[PDB]
Amino acid sequence: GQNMRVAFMPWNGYNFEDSILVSERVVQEDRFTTIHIQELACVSRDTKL
Amino acid sequence: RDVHPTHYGRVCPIETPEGPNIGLINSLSVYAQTNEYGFLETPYRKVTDG
Amino acid sequence: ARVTVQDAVEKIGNRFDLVLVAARRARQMQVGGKDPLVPEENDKTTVIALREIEEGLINNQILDVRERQEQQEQEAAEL
Amino acid sequence: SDEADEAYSVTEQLTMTGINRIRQKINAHGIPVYLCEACGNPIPEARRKIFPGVTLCVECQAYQERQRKHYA
Amino acid sequence: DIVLNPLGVPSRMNIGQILETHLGMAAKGIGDKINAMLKQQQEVAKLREFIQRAYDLGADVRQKVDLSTFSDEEVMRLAENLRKGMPIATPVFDGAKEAEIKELLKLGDLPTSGQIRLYDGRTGEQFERPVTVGYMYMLKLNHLVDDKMHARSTGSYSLVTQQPLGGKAQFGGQRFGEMEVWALEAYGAAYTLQEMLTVKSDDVNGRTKMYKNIVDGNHQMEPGMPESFNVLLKEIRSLGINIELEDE
Amino acid sequence: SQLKLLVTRGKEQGYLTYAEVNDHLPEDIVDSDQIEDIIQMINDMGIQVMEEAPDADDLMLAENTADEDAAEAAAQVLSSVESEIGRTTDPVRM
Amino acid sequence: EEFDAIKIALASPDMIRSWSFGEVKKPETINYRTFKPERDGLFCARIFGPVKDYECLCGKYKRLKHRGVICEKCGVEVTQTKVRRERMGHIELASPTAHIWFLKSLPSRIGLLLDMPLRDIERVLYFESYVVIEGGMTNLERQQILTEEQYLDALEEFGDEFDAKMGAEAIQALLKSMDLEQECEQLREELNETNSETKRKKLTKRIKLLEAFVQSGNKPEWMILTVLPVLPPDLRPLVPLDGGRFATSDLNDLYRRVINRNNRLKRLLDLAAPDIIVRNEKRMLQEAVDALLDNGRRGRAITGSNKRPLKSLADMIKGKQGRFRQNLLGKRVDYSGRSVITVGPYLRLHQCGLPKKMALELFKPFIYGKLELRGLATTIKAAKKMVEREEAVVWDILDEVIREHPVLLNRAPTLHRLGIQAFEPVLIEGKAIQLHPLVCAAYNADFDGDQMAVHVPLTLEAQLEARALMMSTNNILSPANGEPIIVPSQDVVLGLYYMTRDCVNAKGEGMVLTGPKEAERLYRSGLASLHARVKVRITEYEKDANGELVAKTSLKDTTVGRAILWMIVPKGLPYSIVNQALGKKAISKMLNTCYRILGLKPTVIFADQIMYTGFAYAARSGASVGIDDMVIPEKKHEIISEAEAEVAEIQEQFQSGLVTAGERYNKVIDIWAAANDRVSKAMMDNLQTETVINRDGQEEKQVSFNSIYMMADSGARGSAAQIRQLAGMRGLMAKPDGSIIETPITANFREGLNVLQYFISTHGARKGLADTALKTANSGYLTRRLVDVAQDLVVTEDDCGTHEGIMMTPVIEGGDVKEPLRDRVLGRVTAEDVLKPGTADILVPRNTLLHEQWCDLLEENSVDAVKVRSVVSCDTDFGVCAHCYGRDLARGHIINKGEAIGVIAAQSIGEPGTQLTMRTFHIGSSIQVKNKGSIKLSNVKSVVNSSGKLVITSRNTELKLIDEFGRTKESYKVPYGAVLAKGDGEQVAGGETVANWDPHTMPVITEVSGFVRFTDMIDGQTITRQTDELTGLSSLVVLDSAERTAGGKDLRPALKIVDAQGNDVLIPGTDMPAQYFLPGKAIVQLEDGVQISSGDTLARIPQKDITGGLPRVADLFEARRPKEPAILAEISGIVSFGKETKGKRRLVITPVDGSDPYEEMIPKWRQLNVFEGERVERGDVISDGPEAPHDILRLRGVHAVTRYIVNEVQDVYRLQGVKINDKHIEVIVRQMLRKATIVNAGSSDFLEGEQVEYSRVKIANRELEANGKVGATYSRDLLGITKASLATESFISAASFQETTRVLTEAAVAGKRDELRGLKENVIVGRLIPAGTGYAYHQDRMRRRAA
Ligand SMILES: [Mg+2]
Ligand SMILES: [Zn+2]
Ligand SMILES: [Zn+2]
Ligand SMILES: [Zn+2]
């Protein structure tokens, strides 16, 4: 992962039980913007019809 | 499912997937190898007299 | 638009007959049976039924009295 | 809670019950005995000082612990 | 950036992350000092004395670097790859003893306590009692939300038992198992349960009559009888067992 | 009769083992089909194991089913199968 | 289709033909070129209907008008294709064949129906041995089997008038040829003549069986199949998978095998092969059919082309994947979803967040209806294209469908009935179900990725139930005790505990404020800290008047913190609730007092306000944790040096031979744990009061603001143990064996842990994991087992109308009162009226719901016991009346009519069971009164000795502690004859000893004071030459049996008491003269020659672990008799001995005059704690040890055993510190002791020694004795839950959780017309549950029926 400037303090309970509260400067830069690649198949079978 | 006092250097004590099967999925330690006959074997430094 | 029903369960006890009475009343207001007796707060018919239960102006007895009244109003419109 | 915290409470229970079992085994209270309760031999007063209320000698104590190793 | 929860450390003995936060804070301290020394661009002698201070640093180690061997056009490269923050190491059970971290924070200019006064960002007034800060290294486990999310209004259906069986992201209902039924029996909820396992789920006429009624804006449910129990009659009867339904 | 002693031990001890049953069994049959039948009978008896391992903890702990009117017939089938003769099993062997 | 009870019975052959639609004949299934079905095989068209809806097979007729006409070319009835799913065809088995269930069920149905052992049946079936079938009357018994050669001879014996077969033909001949009325008459005959209780026992048992099998509609030969039905085609499909590969079920395979073997047998018969051939073929067909039905009980399954045994018809019903457990209870559900839950504090607690996209996928039908209503799409397809474009207006229409429509939100395991709560929705960007925060404690859900599922209630009754019963703000009281389950958990309480504390010198010291309002105006502007002690003018509203609220201004002396917390507290509460520290316990009893005073609405809105202000000031605290926060004690290195020197002491002393290895190990572990506790205390006192600051003067110390200390003090997280491990040393890791390692961890987490120490930690860490892995996978076994037994139980009467409850008092276990009376009579309703100690009154009517007002009165008047009505003595038939269950519920009013209390009871007992150690777990001579208060003795039998002191001559005198109030403040159990000091009902002083006795040795102290001699004390025979021979103590002590002669065993060891001449004075009251006899080991000291004093030790006779796990609760409800059963009296009368030592010595007890002869056999390896000359009361401790609950139930009575079980399992919980109200355990007990036994039937028609259940026999004798006739005596039973659930009026229920096969077959032979009206039953058959809302509906059907 990537290192990012954390600070330990409750702050209105948007991290109540075990939660995290990421600030939009983390989401703008694309520094967790991770990439996923899929393999969609579309076969063409040989029906009796 | 448990750790026995001879895992020291042959199986990670703190790596095993918690949940259904803990301890059954031990991870081979860092420096450790497989013996000739097949056992696990770790390194040590031979100490002479002192 | 209503956090609880606790006034309703006070008025018409048993907390289950409440559910049944309110459901019947709601089918009346939703399917074209009737219209509400409490000023609607643009709420769905469920809340309006619980509320009319809350005022002591719907219950099992009153609903059966109106069943009787509409059954007898029809036989004088069938002739 | 979490799958770690439950494990913490269980481990604390396990070590607590162990430690209390081994504090209960040590006597540290009783009346002086002056002689073995099995063979009649004398308990030397140094050993009695180490444990107030030693019902056994060291010989009989070792013997009893040694039979009890086989857990019978 | 991230604002974790302090109530998670004392309950879980993993004070490791707090030591890591302080050490990372100090490491970015070295990084920003190099950043200023490079961006106010000084001369390679300044960077040599400073980075060479950052690598010697006190207690005995197995690391000594001797930056008087690098050329100028290497120490400049080295500084540029360090300006983001001086990567500190810590072999596992031979870690950074806390005095070493306090000194590596003094080498920066952070507060040796490890904590900073944080001004709130909405009310603009100082959070009492200086909070922790620092750079924690945070992964991203692949339990992403848009792989777990799922919702099924009316998908495909199984073949032997007419139950919801959809595929895509198990494109079917949630397993409304047994203990949930004990829950819904514990309430007085009887109609919700009934439409939970007669209309919504199995009864292959009840479900389409339900759907037609929903689209017509008439929330009833003409339930009928499940399909699973019907299969159970046909099986229990395939044996030599006359199962019936008395009619009265 | 000793297999009836296996029965009473399975009643008291709360389980058995392959070694226990294989100890008490009536000698000279050992086809391993009669054995599988008799082990299924001891399972259908009060004993509900048949074991390999003795225990067993909080994981499904303290389990039991009374199953009255099955014990008296199962133990009867045991005492009859031992005393009279060893019955054949399956039909290829028939 | 509101049919009836379901009915089951044998499958008569012509019935099996009426089920048919044409005989299957051939093993083909499909046609390998055109995948139409071959006719006629397992599949067909003409048999089981058409393939394509309304289309023939050959294709002549293909229109809806032609429905019904069977095509002349291939006879396929053109009809729907779902008719392919309901048609059963049959097979014509050439030779008959035995149904495996009615052969190998365990107790053979045919065995105990023919009066024949099983091995002979297997003989006749598998052709082992011939057998007679009505062999006439020449020589042979009817059942008399034969063998080969014997039949060969007998054909020469009686070739005529003879009848012997073998095979299924034989069993069928026997069963048919049987005549059941004949056997009933014969069995009643031998019940008449054969007077042998074992004999006529089994005789009358078999006659019970035959009369049952006659009173069904059955016939005995229907157990042997001639015609065997095939399952339809679409329950065992042959689906075309992609690629030509077909994926068929297994029944096609089995039926193919059976049809092959039937056809082959018919083919053999046409040829008339030799008898070995036809015999092996019939055996093959027998095995084939027996593998079709069960594929087990036959010895070895016939696995398919896999190596995996192929499933069969008795196996598609059974198991946790059969239709019962896997598709009749756990069924998938349309209109559901799920996601990652999240935090979302901006919500009132009655609305869960929810994504826009899950909403627009759950509510498509609602959207479509609304969109064809507002004319935004004329046809439904247009509306679909719209909402699939996600256009502008479907979000508006979705917000108009999601106005008042409650979604049900579930978590993965739903233990307790708060596990499934509904909410309203609030449409949200994103994909996390933003749950509320407070409710997470209820779900038991942190936010580490846990996934809750949302359902949707379709109908209108279900919406009113997801609002009026399952809404979030109607379940805040936990079902297992009245305390709210909306306890603020971790950031909220830290926020308050930081808010309402006081540092000694902050800004704004001492300045007075005009109220709370300018307390906030000071804090926000910054002129004064959040906490600095300050006079204000609060105004609390106490409501002592009848519903009034009397204002009362004042100047409380508080901080600013408490005051700014005060603007949120609603009216009725008093200000002394928020003036303290406001930890977690106090901040939860804040909500508790709010609910107990102001009802529900202000408590809900107040819990929300608390969470809001808690989060706000918890964020303002900046309550961060940093590495300077964990302070090590500077006196740690000394303590560790000191203990590591004490181990040097024990090492030196071990290698001097003074202590064994075990002793040095124990002593080492003792000094390390001591060092551990000392270091932990030193850190905690360097940590708590550590902060020292200074008000306008020198210095002063206060509780600290060390962030970790507030996090450990509030109750937010952790405690002193985790604070130990972070700062002080961390103990002694315990290796998973259970044995504790002796090498402690002298380091801690602020310091490092070198390699050995961390590694040793690994043992206990991984044991914790390997147990909380087995606990999460076996978490609901106890709730499962309880709702199996306690399910069909519904509060179905308003008032049972009785006066018989159980007496409640505060438990006191020889010390400070554990559980007071306001926690036990809080909700239950009184049984008989309550009188203030002068009676003075009628304090409370007998039917007063004891809410907290009445507990107020009871605690103002100091009432000690309140005979309160209880679930286990309600007089209702199939139910539990309204009152006697009491009131407890998520609500606070009396329990409604119908609300299914069995389930919520089992869950109240089973959800805290998650909060208990899963492994079992063992915790391990003078009386000392605590304080002022008089003495109180019960069952005290004292003698006024000539010595002066007091001694009790009753075995069971309890030493209580009463005050001048009259309350029972303390109670102690005196052993026999303890030396007593003070008076009986008199006054004593606090903390003063009042009773002493002999610790291990039993006195035999005399009755009155008279002269002494001896009888039957001859040394060598009855006595031995004992003496403390350095002192002269002639002790001719009673000889035991192994030292008394065989006539000595006939001797009577004795102590005679002579009067002043040589006679024996009568014992006072009785006429047994003055003497005491004694057993073996009745060690005598003095002899003949002294006058005794009351309190003479005439002899010297020598001589608790509480398991606390969950398995202790499992075994409590299982009611297993313990190992050492507490031997207990049987008849209230005098005691004596019996036939001396026949291995087990025999006691003998005798009443005044009645049925005396009871003697009991006892293992004489165990003490007998009874005198040899006393009158043991019925239900009295002859011996010690745990006493079996069955003996409680049979000796004492119901209420005794119920108080036993509730106090025992309450011990098991309140050991661990878990609250659970006793209604729930009492109702599970009322389900335990349901069955009954009979003593004398008399004017009823039940068999005497038969077992029948209590409700049935009780209504029987209630209506009979209501007549002029006489009742029927019944001895109550008590079953474990696993056996008390094992009997059920229904079989559809007992086919779920019991093993299905035994249930089905027993019901089948019995022809048991199972009604509905359970809950398993109706949840299976999918009509209204008769528990909750469905109860009025079932009353409707009850009225319909019977009229
Ligand atoms: Mg979790
Ligand atoms: Zn000795
Ligand atoms: Zn045709
Ligand atoms: Zn009652």
Author numbering:
A (entry chain I): 797 to 845
B (entry chain I): 548 to 597
C (entry chain K): 2 to 80
D (entry chain M): 2 to 73
E (entry chain I): 1095 to 1342
F (entry chain L): 7 to 100
G (entry chain J): 15 to 938, 948 to 1126, 1132 to 1375
Which statements did the authors publish about this structure?
Upon locating the promoter, Eσ70 melts a ~ 13 bp segment of DNA to form the open promoter complex (RPo) in which the DNA template strand (t-strand) is loaded into the RNAP active site, exposing the transcription start site. Although only half the length of DksA, TraR regulates Eco transcription by binding to the RNAP secondary channel and mimicking the combined effects of ppGpp and DksA. To help understand TraR regulation and principles of the regulation of transcription initiation in general, we used single particle cryo-electron microscopy (cryo-EM) to examine structures of Eσ70 alone, Eσ70 bound to TraR (TraR-Eσ70), and Eσ70 bound to a promoter inhibited by TraR [rpsT P2; Gopalkrishnan et al., 2017].
The first class [TraR-Eσ70(I)] contained approximately 41% of the particles and resolved to a nominal resolution of 3.7 Å. In TraR-Eσ70(I) and TraR-Eσ70(II), Si3 is in two distinct positions with respect to the RNAP, while in TraR-Eσ70(III) Si3 is disordered. The TraR-Eσ70 structures show TraR binding in the secondary channel of the RNAP, consistent with the TraR-Eσ70 model and crystal structure. TraRN extends from the RNAP active site out through the RNAP secondary channel to the β’rim-helices (at the entrance to the RNAP secondary channel), interacting with key RNAP structural elements surrounding the active site, including the -NADFDGD- motif that chelates the active site Mg2+, the F-loop, and the bridge-helix. TraR binding induces a ~ 18° rotation of the RNAP βlobe-Si1 domains (the two domains move together as a rigid body), shifting the βlobe-Si1 towards TraR, allowing the βlobe-Si1 to establish an interface with TraRG and TraRC (615 Å2 interface area). TraR causes the BH to kink towards the t-strand DNA, similar to BH kinks observed previously, resulting in a steric clash with the normal position of the t-strand nucleotide at +2.
